[PDB]
Design an enzyme around this catalytic site. Sequence first.
Site, mmCIF file in Angstrom:
data_model
loop_
_atom_site.group_PDB
_atom_site.id
_atom_site.type_symbol
_atom_site.label_atom_id
_atom_site.label_comp_id
_atom_site.label_asym_id
_atom_site.label_seq_id
_atom_site.Cartn_x
_atom_site.Cartn_y
_atom_site.Cartn_z
ATOM 1 N N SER A 1 -2.609 -9.583 -4.197
ATOM 2 C CA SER A 1 -2.891 -10.669 -5.123
ATOM 3 C C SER A 1 -1.616 -11.146 -5.820
ATOM 4 C CB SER A 1 -3.984 -10.320 -6.119
ATOM 5 O OG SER A 1 -3.560 -9.369 -7.086
ATOM 6 N N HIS B 1 -8.570 -4.848 -1.300
ATOM 7 C CA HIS B 1 -7.916 -5.102 -2.569
ATOM 8 C C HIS B 1 -8.944 -4.900 -3.683
ATOM 9 C CE1 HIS B 1 -4.510 -5.977 -4.890
ATOM 10 N NE2 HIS B 1 -4.544 -7.293 -4.896
ATOM 11 N N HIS C 1 -3.899 5.219 -1.771
ATOM 12 C CA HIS C 1 -3.082 4.078 -2.156
ATOM 13 C C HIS C 1 -1.991 3.850 -1.115
ATOM 14 C CE1 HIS C 1 -2.553 1.342 -5.605
ATOM 15 N NE2 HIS C 1 -1.327 1.207 -5.158
ATOM 16 N N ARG D 1 -3.876 4.826 -14.185
ATOM 17 C CA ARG D 1 -4.985 3.952 -14.528
ATOM 18 C C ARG D 1 -6.307 4.709 -14.413
ATOM 19 N NH1 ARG D 1 -3.906 -1.106 -10.813
ATOM 20 N NH2 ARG D 1 -3.492 0.630 -9.381
ATOM 21 N N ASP E 1 -9.860 1.903 -9.136
ATOM 22 C CA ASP E 1 -11.174 1.386 -8.778
ATOM 23 C C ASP E 1 -12.209 2.502 -8.636
ATOM 24 O OD1 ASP E 1 -10.358 -1.457 -8.495
ATOM 25 O OD2 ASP E 1 -9.324 -0.763 -6.664
HETATM 26 C C1 LIG Z 1 -5.814 -0.685 -2.905
HETATM 27 C C2 LIG Z 1 -6.755 0.129 -3.721
HETATM 28 O O1 LIG Z 1 -6.527 0.473 -4.856
HETATM 29 S S1 LIG Z 1 -8.237 0.535 -2.836
HETATM 30 C C3 LIG Z 1 -8.408 -0.089 -1.147
HETATM 31 C C4 LIG Z 1 -9.721 0.268 -0.498
HETATM 32 N N1 LIG Z 1 -10.057 1.670 -0.691
HETATM 33 C C5 LIG Z 1 -10.856 2.364 0.127
HETATM 34 O O2 LIG Z 1 -11.391 1.857 1.112
HETATM 35 C C6 LIG Z 1 -11.065 3.828 -0.202
HETATM 36 C C7 LIG Z 1 -10.024 4.694 0.461
HETATM 37 N N2 LIG Z 1 -8.713 4.055 0.471
HETATM 38 C C8 LIG Z 1 -8.132 3.591 1.573
HETATM 39 O O3 LIG Z 1 -8.468 3.933 2.705
HETATM 40 C C9 LIG Z 1 -6.994 2.598 1.384
HETATM 41 O O4 LIG Z 1 -7.228 1.462 2.202
HETATM 42 C C10 LIG Z 1 -5.575 3.125 1.651
HETATM 43 C C11 LIG Z 1 -4.575 2.178 0.972
HETATM 44 C C12 LIG Z 1 -5.431 4.524 1.036
HETATM 45 C C13 LIG Z 1 -5.221 3.205 3.137
HETATM 46 O O5 LIG Z 1 -3.921 3.862 3.269
HETATM 47 P P1 LIG Z 1 -2.891 3.410 4.415
HETATM 48 O O6 LIG Z 1 -2.022 2.323 3.868
HETATM 49 O O7 LIG Z 1 -3.650 3.170 5.677
HETATM 50 O O8 LIG Z 1 -2.046 4.765 4.587
HETATM 51 P P2 LIG Z 1 -2.516 6.301 4.637
HETATM 52 O O9 LIG Z 1 -1.464 7.110 5.321
HETATM 53 O O10 LIG Z 1 -2.937 6.734 3.272
HETATM 54 O O11 LIG Z 1 -3.817 6.180 5.572
HETATM 55 C C14 LIG Z 1 -3.784 6.521 6.983
HETATM 56 C C15 LIG Z 1 -5.087 7.180 7.367
HETATM 57 O O12 LIG Z 1 -5.604 7.925 6.233
HETATM 58 C C16 LIG Z 1 -6.954 7.581 6.025
HETATM 59 N N3 LIG Z 1 -7.285 7.758 4.610
HETATM 60 C C17 LIG Z 1 -6.593 7.286 3.521
HETATM 61 N N4 LIG Z 1 -7.160 7.614 2.382
HETATM 62 C C18 LIG Z 1 -8.287 8.340 2.745
HETATM 63 C C19 LIG Z 1 -9.300 8.966 1.994
HETATM 64 N N5 LIG Z 1 -9.347 8.957 0.665
HETATM 65 N N6 LIG Z 1 -10.281 9.603 2.678
HETATM 66 C C20 LIG Z 1 -10.227 9.609 4.017
HETATM 67 N N7 LIG Z 1 -9.327 9.057 4.826
HETATM 68 C C21 LIG Z 1 -8.372 8.432 4.118
HETATM 69 C C22 LIG Z 1 -7.069 6.145 6.522
HETATM 70 O O13 LIG Z 1 -8.416 5.794 6.761
HETATM 71 C C23 LIG Z 1 -6.209 6.226 7.786
HETATM 72 O O14 LIG Z 1 -6.956 6.785 8.868
HETATM 73 P P3 LIG Z 1 -7.046 5.828 10.168
HETATM 74 O O15 LIG Z 1 -5.624 5.602 10.646
HETATM 75 O O16 LIG Z 1 -7.888 6.576 11.188
HETATM 76 O O17 LIG Z 1 -7.705 4.539 9.719
HETATM 77 O O1 LIG Z 2 -3.393 -2.874 -3.836
HETATM 78 C C1 LIG Z 2 -2.262 -2.649 -4.308
HETATM 79 O O2 LIG Z 2 -1.202 -2.870 -3.696
HETATM 80 C C2 LIG Z 2 -2.165 -2.091 -5.724
HETATM 81 C C3 LIG Z 2 -3.440 -2.225 -6.534
HETATM 82 O O3 LIG Z 2 -4.270 -1.329 -6.467
HETATM 83 C C4 LIG Z 2 -3.649 -3.209 -7.372
HETATM 84 O O4 LIG Z 2 -3.041 -4.269 -7.233
HETATM 85 O O5 LIG Z 2 -4.496 -3.059 -8.245
#
Ligand SMILES: CC(=O)SCCNC(=O)CCNC(=O)[C@H](O)C(C)(C)COP(=O)(O)OP(=O)(O)OC[C@H]1O[C@@H](n2cnc3c(N)ncnc32)[C@H](O)[C@@H]1OP(=O)(O)O
Ligand SMILES: O=C([O-])CC(=O)C(=O)O
Lengths: 434, 434
Positions: free
Chosen positions: A242, A272, A318, A327, A373
Amino acid sequence: STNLKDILADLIPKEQARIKTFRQQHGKTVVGQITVDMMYGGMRGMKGLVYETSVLDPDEGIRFRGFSIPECQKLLPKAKGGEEPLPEGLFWLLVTGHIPTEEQVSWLSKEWAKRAALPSHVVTMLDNFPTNLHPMSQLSAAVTALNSESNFARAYAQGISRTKYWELIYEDSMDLIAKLPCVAAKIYRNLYREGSGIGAIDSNLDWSHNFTNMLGYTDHQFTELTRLYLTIHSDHEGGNVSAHTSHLVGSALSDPYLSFAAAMNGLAGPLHGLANQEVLVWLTQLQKEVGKDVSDEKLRDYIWNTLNSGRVVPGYGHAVLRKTDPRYTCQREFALKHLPNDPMFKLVAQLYKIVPNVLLEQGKAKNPWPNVDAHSGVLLQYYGMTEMNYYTVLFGVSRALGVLAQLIWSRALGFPLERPKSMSTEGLMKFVDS
Amino acid sequence: STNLKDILADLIPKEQARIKTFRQQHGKTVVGQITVDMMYGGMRGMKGLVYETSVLDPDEGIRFRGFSIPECQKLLPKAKGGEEPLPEGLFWLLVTGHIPTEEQVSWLSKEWAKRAALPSHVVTMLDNFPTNLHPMSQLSAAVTALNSESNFARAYAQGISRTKYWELIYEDSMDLIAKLPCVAAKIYRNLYREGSGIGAIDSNLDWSHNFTNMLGYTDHQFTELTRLYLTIHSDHEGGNVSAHTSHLVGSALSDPYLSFAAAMNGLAGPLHGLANQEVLVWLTQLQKEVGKDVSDEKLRDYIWNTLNSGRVVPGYGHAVLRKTDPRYTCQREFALKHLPNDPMFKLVAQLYKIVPNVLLEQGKAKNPWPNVDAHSGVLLQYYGMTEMNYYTVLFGVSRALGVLAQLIWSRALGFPLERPKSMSTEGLMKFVDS
Ligand SMILES: CC(=O)SCCNC(=O)CCNC(=O)[C@H](O)C(C)(C)COP(=O)(O)OP(=O)(O)OC[C@H]1O[C@@H](n2cnc3c(N)ncnc32)[C@H](O)[C@@H]1OP(=O)(O)O
Ligand SMILES: O=C([O-])CC(=O)C(=O)O
Ligand SMILES: CC(C)(COP(=O)(O)OP(=O)(O)OC[C@H]1O[C@@H](n2cnc3c(N)ncnc32)[C@H](O)[C@@H]1OP(=O)(O)O)[C@@H](O)C(=O)NCCC(=O)NCCS
């Protein structure tokens, strides 16, 4: 004195020199490599852009112009008989780089009540939005339409000077921030209160209190929540979808309305801003598979069952943060004080005991700790704000503070069009095959 | 056979294998450096992202899937009794990578005609818009509202597997493209035709033919111009602000309507999509401040008097092009056929002789040659498309073909969240030391 625009005018030249010098010394210093994986991996690890207002260390979370969340909680002015920092103060900190006085914040609260008026076309447009158009779409659409009130737009049309851009941004930004609660309330009342009216602004309330007033809430502790919520969601570096979007669209010299609108379309994405809902769905459906009072045993199972069948624990993880988000910590601390025996919170709380052991057990991740979140949903829900699909809008209103704070500076520091070079795979292949 | 969705389905696996094979080979390879200059300079020169539909080598200009504009004009199908490539054909090539047949394009036309229905809330919303709201804000505002019809946003909510993303994206994309002429026409007619109806779609005509029928033009030559205009403006790499916003917004799993609306807010920016307007303002005065018939010395002087005055010559230069843009040449060719003796044309042609000679002398401009925006205005004005504010709506309808072609592939290849790391000035200063 209490005029932010005068204070900012006196700051801009100082900052310009510092930056102009800094590029006249170290412009050609390689700060990072770019791998094929970075280009396919969404610039992961790529230092891409300058964002002045906030910085995110992957260890201790966000800092607003140097100050952490606890530091902001202590220093930033509060409402008379409050303990949570006002968003007004946060904005001042991001714009000036300095903690404001009580009286500076007061004046800011006064400025945002004056400019809170909506054009009629925008009021009509919201009134005529169907109930199957997502809140966020309504928000973005309405803000786009506000752009007819844009000072920067007409100014640029007449051939205003580059030196004066930031000034029109500022005015447009102050107007947008002022009007956001009103837009956000109208949406909320049309979708969830049979179209009833938002009422009038009160010039001797703060931004957050007027917001909750227009929403229809009359709870003190809710308004304290809103205050905190709006502060801590305000900004999170330039790299987030964003903030990057606002920066990207802003760099084409689109006015704040268009830039913010675009940023909301970014925020609306599941990965996001829509994570706030996802969590609460998954929390409730958890309390559907089990009872509403699961212990640790069953709890350890539901977590593992979600993490074996090939799913994610929502609000955990993250893209750069590798520890618990400050947060999250901050929202948790709020709950420990005000709603400590809430069924939904204690579920949230219990996951914080269990999930950060099983995620770093199984691997297949990098950040096993929670993000902002994971926690916001239960706080809103406790206070009667149960309309999940509206939650990101609250996010939207907060993040305006941060991204608009930045946009003022981008156009004062004359940042130019963001315009990287792209590559096809085909073209990438021949390149490495030099 | 003629079903694009099924052919796309066949190609995706192959493309997945290719990228995987390539990442499993050169995944860690370095493709470029990141400097402090690139950070403050808006990622200029930085290899930011993978984008598959088109590539812009600065030497020979844009290629659509390795095909140049001339090849496309020759290879892409045309309308029965016509000469200009159908944008349908362009869209086919960007999605599949192959040149479509007569039949394949014909089908695509019918499918877009089939999907041209506008939800009534959007029709209402458009009709209730005031005239002081710019064409582009109305387009963007409307596109956002249209995301009530997003199959992807519904499906995602209901919890669909990632591997199906692309298929929902494809559907929404086709609906958006199908509906854009209907929106763009409604905006044109409300703003410039006293709010009169647009008229029905004809399922046997082409996309550009229906469009101009609703715009209320029926000069064959203008339909042909549209066809050319919509093809050549279709895409221009990933790095331009409209394509990049959509990419960025798309990466958060925001739907095609939200992604494209955001891209349009980027496109509405002065520095991205007003240069066509800026050119024609600057061509007009040039034929009042100097005689209509002008010597090539008088003109040459005017250019130098332009440069000294601190004003830029609009239509010339680019962020990565370093030679005559093929989209200019393409339009130059069209004019030599269809309006060689037009006064406004003869000027454009005159400037092409002069302006390049002087900019390289001065030295500043790294690209002394004209871009697309130099030429489009005089062609549009000639056919009685003289509403300059609207021009960007045409650009935007065109760019939908490129950015939505790519968006399907970003989701089919599972490109992840675009999320770079940012830095503050103060933070950068500490970094370069250690
Ligand atoms: C941006 C925010 O504040 S929230 C975004 C949405 N959040 C969700 O869906 C809940 C869990 N969070 C996520 O999966 C987020 O999209 C992220 C940012 C952590 C993903 O991380 P990436 O940038 O892909 O890097 P990371 O090395 O952490 O993840 C790689 C693997 O870990 C997995 N992973 C990351 N966090 C978790 C978790 N909490 N539980 C299980 N698996 C996870 C991903 O699904 C991915 O597996 P895949 O390659 O089979 O898809
Ligand atoms: O998604 C990101 O890069 C960081 C985030 O959680 C936010 O903007 O609130
Ligand atoms: C498109 C444009 C902004 C790209 O410029 P850029 O990416 O900043 O980079 P350049 O290498 O062209 O800039 C080098 C210098 O040449 C100047 N320059 C570039 N094009 C010029 C032109 N057509 N006439 C005069 N000067 C020009 C720039 O102002 C700059 O001066 P500076 O470095 O002293 O500030 C610029 O060429 C321009 O203003 N063109 C006219 C507007 C237009 O047609 N835009 C449509 C395409 S986005």
